[PDB]
Amino acid sequence: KHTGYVGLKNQGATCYMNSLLQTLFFTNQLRKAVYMMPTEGDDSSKSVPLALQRVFYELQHSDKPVGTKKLTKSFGWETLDSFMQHDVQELCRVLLDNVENKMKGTCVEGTIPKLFRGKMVSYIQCKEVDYRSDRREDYYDIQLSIKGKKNIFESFVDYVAVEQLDGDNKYDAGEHGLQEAEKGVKFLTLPPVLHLQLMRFMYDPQTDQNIKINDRFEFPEQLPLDEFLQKTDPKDPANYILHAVLVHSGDNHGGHYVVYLNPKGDGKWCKFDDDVVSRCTKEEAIEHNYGGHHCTNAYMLVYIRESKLSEVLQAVTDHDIPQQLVERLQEEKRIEAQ
Amino acid sequence: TGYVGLKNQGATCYMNSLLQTLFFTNQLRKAVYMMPTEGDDSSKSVPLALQRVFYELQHSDKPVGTKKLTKSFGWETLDSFMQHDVQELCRVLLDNVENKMKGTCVEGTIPKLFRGKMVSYIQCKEVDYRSDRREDYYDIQLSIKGKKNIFESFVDYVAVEQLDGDNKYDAGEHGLQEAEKGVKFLTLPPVLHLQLMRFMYDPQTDQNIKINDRFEFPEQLPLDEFLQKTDPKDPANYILHAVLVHSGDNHGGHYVVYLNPKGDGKWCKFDDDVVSRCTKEEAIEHNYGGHHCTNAYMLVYIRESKLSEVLQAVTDHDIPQQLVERLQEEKRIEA
Numbered sequence: 001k002h003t004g005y006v007g008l009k010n011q012g013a014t015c016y017m018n019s020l021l022q023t024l025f026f027t028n029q030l031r032k033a034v035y036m037m038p039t040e041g042d043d044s045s046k047s048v049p050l051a052l053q054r055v056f057y058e059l060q061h062s063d064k065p066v067g068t069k070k071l072t073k074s075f076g077w078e079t080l081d082s083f084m085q086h087d088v089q090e091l092c093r094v095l096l097d098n099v100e101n102k103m104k105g106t107c108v109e110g111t112i113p114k115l116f117r118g119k120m121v122s123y124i125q126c127k128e129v130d131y132r133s134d135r136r137e138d139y140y141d142i143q144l145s146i147k148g149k150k151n152i153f154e155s156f157v158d159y160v161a162v163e164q165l166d167g168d169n170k171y172d173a174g175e176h177g178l179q180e181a182e183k184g185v186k187f188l189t190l191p192p193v194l195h196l197q198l199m200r201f202m203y204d205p206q207t208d209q210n211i212k213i214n215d216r217f218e219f220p221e222q223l224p225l226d227e228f229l230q231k232t233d234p235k236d237p238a239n240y241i242l243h244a245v246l247v248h249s250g251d252n253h254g255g256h257y258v259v260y261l262n263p264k265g266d267g268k269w270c271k272f273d274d275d276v277v278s279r280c281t282k283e284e285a286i287e288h289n290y291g292g293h294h295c296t297n298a299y300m301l302v303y304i305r306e307s308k309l310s311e312v313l314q315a316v317t318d319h320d321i322p323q324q325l326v327e328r329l330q331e332e333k334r335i336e337a338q
Numbered sequence: 339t340g341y342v343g344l345k346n347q348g349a350t351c352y353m354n355s356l357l358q359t360l361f362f363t364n365q366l367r368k369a370v371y372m373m374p375t376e377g378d379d380s381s382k383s384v385p386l387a388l389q390r391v392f393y394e395l396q397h398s399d400k401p402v403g404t405k406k407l408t409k410s411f412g413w414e415t416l417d418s419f420m421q422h423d424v425q426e427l428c429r430v431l432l433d434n435v436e437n438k439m440k441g442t443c444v445e446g447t448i449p450k451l452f453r454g455k456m457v458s459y460i461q462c463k464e465v466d467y468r469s470d471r472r473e474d475y476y477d478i479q480l481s482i483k484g485k486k487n488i489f490e491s492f493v494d495y496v497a498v499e500q501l502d503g504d505n506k507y508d509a510g511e512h513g514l515q516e517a518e519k520g521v522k523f524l525t526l527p528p529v530l531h532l533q534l535m536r537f538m539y540d541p542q543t544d545q546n547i548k549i550n551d552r553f554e555f556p557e558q559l560p561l562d563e564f565l566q567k568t569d570p571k572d573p574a575n576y577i578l579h580a581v582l583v584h585s586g587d588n589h590g591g592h593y594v595v596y597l598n599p600k601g602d603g604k605w606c607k608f609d610d611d612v613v614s615r616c617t618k619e620e621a622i623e624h625n626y627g628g629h630h631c632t633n634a635y636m637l638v639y640i641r642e643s644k645l646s647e648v649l650q651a652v653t654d655h656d657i658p659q660q661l662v663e664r665l666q667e668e669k670r671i672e673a
């Protein structure tokens with residue numbers, strides 16, 4: 001009510017889910033394209049696209065906290081710990097893959113790659129012979145190492161750092177035999193919506209299963225990324241605006257998951273805590289989640305390219321929801337009300 | 339502390355708390371070890387799953403897992419535990435074990451430990467008719483809204499209710515009559531499970547909401563004046579054994595339990611895998627509530643006179659060799 005935004009019910013150990021759902025919902029261009037999916041023939045029992053349409057609809061219209069049971073049912077994560085055994089980016093990929101496939105053949109085909117997909121090069125360059133292997137790869141999200149790094153910039157420096165293949169890890173160069181080489185990645189494109197997960201756990205033998213890295217890790221409100229591009233572009237520099245901060249406090253999957261957002265990209269932040277949505281300060285959304293200098297910190301960041309902000313966050317009206325969809329969900333709600 | 343914890347493996351809410359609370363019911367634990375579970379399916383048996391959890395809590399150096407248990411009684415959905423009160427889960431477990439103990443040398447352990455008796459009376463005002471009927475109970479739900487403490491809650495619980503107007507009592511001959519109904523406790527069990535009514539329907543909305551009001555409970559609880567008839571050689575004096583605590587507003591809040599397992603006033607906090615010695619004030623007064631939203635929702639009391647028996651020592655010998663061998667082979671196969 002207060003903030004203009006409604007929250008999501010707490011209905012299980014769904015960990016990152018309500019955070020990710022709010023984050024996706026406020027990707028306005030995505031929300032609109034999801035509204036356009038042709039789901040009239042869909043089975044309301046099995047359709048992930050319809051379930052996301054329903055959730056987004058309620059988030060746009062409802063005054064009361066929105067429920068998500070049909071959604072988790074639709075993509076089959078219903079056990080006591082099914083969310084504990086997946087990272088947030090896997091849930092994102094399930095959701096986005098479903099709706100992307102559903103958009104095939106429609107006027108919004110390719111929305112998901114347009115918003116979230118970038119491209120990178122992986123190379124192996126032989127040092128002592130002349131042979132290089134190049135592999136262009138798409139990515140929808142980036143996992144950044146934080147252990148030993150102070151900020152996003154050092155994480156990106158680490159990401160594109162050259163690795164040496166020598167000694168017992170020499171590269172199989174085919175007819176050139178075993179060779180000393182160097183292996184690394186470079187960014188070719190950065191997408192309009194940039195999903196960064198921070199590596200906040202670590203599966204090491206010395207730590208048995210998984211411990212949470214609670215170290216301080218700084219991210220800026222404004223992130224410039226041109227220097228990590230293979231080739232910059234003067235008519236659109238890679239300047240990114242912080243949009244979402246998904247936060248975990250505690251040490252285990254019983255910890256507290258919340259998400260901070262400035263949904264208009266205007267620097268005015270709210271905290272989304274399941275059913276409770278509250279106005280908050282910039283400091284509480286950003287610095288306070290850097291981590292102890294004490295276990296409350298960010299594990300995922302969403303950035304939007306400056307040049308794409310107005311389009312990615314384009315206004316959404318009630319009229320943007322097609323009439324059939326509105327009547328189907330209204331009838332669901334009337335059937336429930338009886 | 340000498341005590342091991344339980345793994346966080348889901349939104350099990352009160353389960354780990356209840357589990358520790360029942361494990362440190364030493365007499366219950368011993369009787370659980372004695373159940374004849376040798377022919378039981380290691381996947382179907384709730385009694386075996388309880389034996390296995392208890393054994394691990396007694397021996398393991400590492401946080402103890404609970405998955406075979408939750409499978410055994412089939413609460414495996416995302417919100418299985420959100421839709422049940424703690425006393426329902428306790429009853430599921432105790433019904434399972436009690437039934438398994440039928441026809442065994444420990445038959446009756448569950449009622450002996452947890453089952454008390456009250457009388458429910460209906461007394462007619464204008465005619466001469468009184469109906470007395472005994473009811474049994476394993477737990478008591480105490481109203482806290484507008485109650486200062488446990489004493490006032492018990493006073494509310496035995497308070498007389500008027501059956502008048504359009505809810506007159508249909509006694510048997512005198513016809514519809516104006517009467518008054520109430521309960522008195524006939525007996526109080528050696529182990530007293532008290533759930534506090536910490537949620538209520540709020541008219542201002544239309545959900546259940548959590549009452550975070552202050553509510554006091556004592557370390558020593560005299561309950562004689564709530565009996566129908568007292569016993570001058572054995573007054574109903576109880577000692578606080580467990581404080582099951584919830585902090586927050588919702589089932590995503592934080593569940594912990596405080597215990598003094600030996601009845602000696604040396605208190606520990608059980609937070610899943612973390613078991614930490616703590617002050618008496620942190621177990622007791624700090625969980626009264628008032629304005630964190632951290633407070634007791636369940637209390638376990640033990641009759642003073644029964645203390646040393648309920649908390650009788652349990653040794654490795656008390657676990658039959660067949661059960662030990664079965665669980666050992668179970669963890670051998672896990673390789």
Ligand SMILES: COC(=O)c1ccc(CN2CCC(O)(Cn3cnc4c(-c5ccc(CN)cc5)n(C)nc4c3=O)CC2)c(Cl)c1
Pocket residue numbers: 016086087088089143197198199200201202210211212213248251252253299300
């Ligand atoms: C046992 O109790 C705990 O210890 C504990 C419980 C919950 C949490 C919070 N949740 C952590 C996971 C989450 O999905 C964020 N997230 C996602 N991916 C990660 C990868 C990573 C890197 C590379 C690749 C290959 N391409 C795949 C994954 N690594 C190394 N760490 C993470 C990570 O934290 C969402 C929040 C934490 Cl922090 C600790």
Ligand SMILES: COC(=O)c1ccc(CN2CCC(O)(Cn3cnc4c(-c5ccc(CN)cc5)n(C)nc4c3=O)CC2)c(Cl)c1
Pocket residue numbers: 352422423424425479533534535536537538546547548549584587588589635
């Ligand atoms: C928005 O609110 C929340 O999301 C919220 C979420 C979790 C909790 C904590 N959990 C509360 C339930 C718990 O089972 C304790 N418990 C048990 N039985 C109760 C009855 C009662 C009375 C009579 C009868 C008929 N014989 C049956 C039940 N009533 C009226 N209240 C309770 C109660 O609190 C365990 C801990 C709370 Cl406090 C609030």
